[PDB]
């Protein structure tokens, strides 16, 4: 399971725990947790940008993953890996960042 071994995936932690980790960190710092929803296989990307934590929803429909219509990524790691090298600006002009610094559960 590529996702469970991903250093930046923290599974079932709270909004409050994530806020502790993201506190005072540089823009581009990010982790992924499970969505507060009941297991739609849904995850939440939290991203540091402009001094606050952006909550970005990772949708899971058919067998695909993504931030909006259409869902085209075959895994959440594939998705996150993509936006490590490409800004999220095309989804929302306020989000002119990449996923730069992973919050690592090994580190």
């Amino acid at each position: 399971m590529s996702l469970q071994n991903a250093e930046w995936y923290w599974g079932d932690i709270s909004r409050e725990e994530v806020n502790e980790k993201l506190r005072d960190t540089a823009d581009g710092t990010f982790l992924v947790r499970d969505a507060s929803t009941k297991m739609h296989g849904d995850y939440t990307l939290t991203l540091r940008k402009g001094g606050n934590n952006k909550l970005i929803k990772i949708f899971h429909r058919d067998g695909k993953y993504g931030f909006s219509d259409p869902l085209t990524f075959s895994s959440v790691v594939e998705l996150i890996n993509h936006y490590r090298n490409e800004s999220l600006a095309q989804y929302n002009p306020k989000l002119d960042v990449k996923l730069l610094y992973p919050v690592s559960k090994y580190q």
Partner: peptide, 11 residues
């Protein structure tokens, strides 16, 4: 944003 960041569709 209000809670979750609005992300635009590409379709």
């Amino acid at each position: 944003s209000i809670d979750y960041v609005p992300m635009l569709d590409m379709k």
